[PDB]
Design a binder for these strands. Sequence first.
RNA 1: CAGCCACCCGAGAUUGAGCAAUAACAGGUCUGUGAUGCCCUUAGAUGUCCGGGGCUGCACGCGCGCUACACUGACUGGCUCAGCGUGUGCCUACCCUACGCCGGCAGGCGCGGGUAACCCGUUGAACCCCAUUCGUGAUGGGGAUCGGGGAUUGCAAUUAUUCCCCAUGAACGAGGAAUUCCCAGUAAGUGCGGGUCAUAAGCUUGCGUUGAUUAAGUCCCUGCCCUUUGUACACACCGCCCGU
Lengths: 55, 143, 72, 126, 189
Amino acid sequence: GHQQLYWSHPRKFGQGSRSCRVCSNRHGLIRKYGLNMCRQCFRQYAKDIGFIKLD
Amino acid sequence: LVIPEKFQHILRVLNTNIDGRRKIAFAITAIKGVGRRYAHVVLRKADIDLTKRAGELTEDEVERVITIMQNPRQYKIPDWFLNRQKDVKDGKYSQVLANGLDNKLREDLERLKKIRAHRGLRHFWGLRVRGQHTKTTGRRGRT
Amino acid sequence: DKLNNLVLFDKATYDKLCKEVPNYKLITPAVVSERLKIRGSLARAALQELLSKGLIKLVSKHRAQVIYTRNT
Amino acid sequence: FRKFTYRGVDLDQLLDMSYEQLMQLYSARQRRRLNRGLRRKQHSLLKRLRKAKKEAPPMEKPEVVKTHLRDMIILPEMVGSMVGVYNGKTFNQVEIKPEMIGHYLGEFSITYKPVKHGRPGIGATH
Amino acid sequence: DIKLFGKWSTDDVQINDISLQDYIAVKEKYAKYLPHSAGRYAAKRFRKAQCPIVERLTNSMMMHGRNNGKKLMTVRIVKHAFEIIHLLTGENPLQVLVNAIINSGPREDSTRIGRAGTVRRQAVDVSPLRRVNQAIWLLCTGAREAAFRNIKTIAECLADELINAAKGSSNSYAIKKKDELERVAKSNR
RNA sequence: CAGCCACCCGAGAUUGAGCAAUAACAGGUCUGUGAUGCCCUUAGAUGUCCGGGGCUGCACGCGCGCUACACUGACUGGCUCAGCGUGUGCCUACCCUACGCCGGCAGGCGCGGGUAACCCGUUGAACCCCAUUCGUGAUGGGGAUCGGGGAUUGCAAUUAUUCCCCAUGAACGAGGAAUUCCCAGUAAGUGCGGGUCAUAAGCUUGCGUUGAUUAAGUCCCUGCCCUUUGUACACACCGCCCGU
Ligand SMILES: [Mg+2]
Ligand SMILES: [Mg+2]
Ligand SMILES: [Zn+2]
């Protein structure tokens, strides 16, 4: 039935199992240090997070 | 100093000509089933001096080298050292050598073409069978 | 063009190795190889044999360059 | 010429053998797959093949069962079965022959049309 | 008592060219045990004239990509072929190298026309530093392509190249190239 | 004078980055967004799951690259040195690994440490160094292609994920016109980490390690600035404009 079919494909490792915590996009994601945000969202929120440019 | 006892400049083994000037374990590599590692293990278990060249060994030495080459498992050569392990049809572990053995077992592509497997079809069409891109590579011999 | 060097000495080339090589100012496997039409392995073996017999003096030995000179 | 033989053993003993004994004759992979287990909808295809073979009239070919699965060519239980393998848009008709043991179904339903080239145009050579 | 390697003195080496005396550094403050000194001679212009000539040769030996930075190999290749120059000639290898440097450096050569031009070449004189640089470069190149695809090892090709250049013989690649350049400068005078 | 050159003393006599004006481009991005205006579609949907294809398909053309053409090298043993750093997760499954045992191997099985200057780790890196065999030839250079086996991650490995073994052993002998990047711990060799990552680097971003040749100049080429000068241009030369 539809209950056993809907979203039944395993999503445990690939890019289909990860997304931006801000915009829910799946591309250019930064998993380092547990940020789990895409590149653009990280550039947007880097100063708030505490990442600042020195060199 | 060259050996007077008919130093074999050319030696015939398995319908192949090996060079007597070449050092052993590299002269017998000319056989189409033997390369480097197999030659070294065959000569180690045949107990012949590896510093000799192929022309200085006697007839008995070459004979026992040929026999140990054709019967690897009979002289404790490991099963993972062979190029025809668990051969389809007769599930026998073996080493295929030279014309009539290596090239005939090469003619197992007709099995793939008879079952019309995709790899056999790629072989029949002259294309590449191990999943490589064919856009910008391998453009030689294709007009 | 393609040189055809020997792998073992013949009596003619084993000669002219025991009474001229011991007279060279510089004895090197490459020099003997070129001047006797023999392979590098054979040249090295012959020079080691000559040195064992005391006819040659070893000047320096290295994995890439071994130098001998006449005993004079 | 001679009776079919797979890894030294022939048709009848291949039918009489269990999966554990199959894993020895199979190559690495097709042994890992069997050790990991045939999941469902593989057993469904196998049982559909069994039913089609049983209902087949004597001396006649079984009816073709169609499937999306690039599945194991299991021991000759599937040999002689008429299977339509989905290639992406069509169910290509394939008869399972004994030499196909140990292969994938997708090896016999090509997913692309082989290229027959046309004249270069536009900016082929800029 | 600062013999090179541990065998070659410098007290007997005579430059005797006057022109290149100030640019070949071999004699008293430039007597070192090894042709390897790290050194910062490229920092300011003309300083490389303070670098010992054997180290300049050693540096020039590391060439054609596969040998870049391998200076220990090159000091070995100089230690050998010094051991071989001594056997072949009986003279100090340093003297042979200095004579080769003197003989293999061009004195004139041609540039693009004078003040300006885009058709022919005009002859001009060579700086002593450029003379030494070109001599080292030519000697190293001759050795390098004598040893390529040949059983003759390096440290034999370089030794014979240096010996021929010291003799002034035309069997030397450096001498041939120097003569070619000098003749072209003569024609464009 | 502003400063320039050289030298002494000196750790150093120009370390490298980050940020960066006025003004402009119909430069790129609606495929990063719960940023967006207008259209289009909206239930046999262009929404959304779920099977299977594709994104790789190969007569050919063009970029960035990797490995080479060997002896200043391959092979085989022996010896001995780094740095940057990342490690067990909101959802979220997936960490880095010492030691013992089993197996050529890739691996497998038990046992511990570590949320980290605490464990991996004293990060026993590669090149390089030392010795060995080869011996100038497509050779033991070089490893494309291809066959047969074995494992690992995964829900599935076929169009071959990756890895291992044994076989097979192509072109390539230094590259035409034409072009790129570079001034000192630099170029170039050489490995190592981070990202991507269930599985994974010929990419990229960082890190050390070995370590040069040459130059200390000029507008010759290529641009790009000015300054004077001309204009009938001002949408500004991709302009304007004349006649059949
Ligand atoms: Mg200009
Ligand atoms: Mg106007
Ligand atoms: Zn985002």
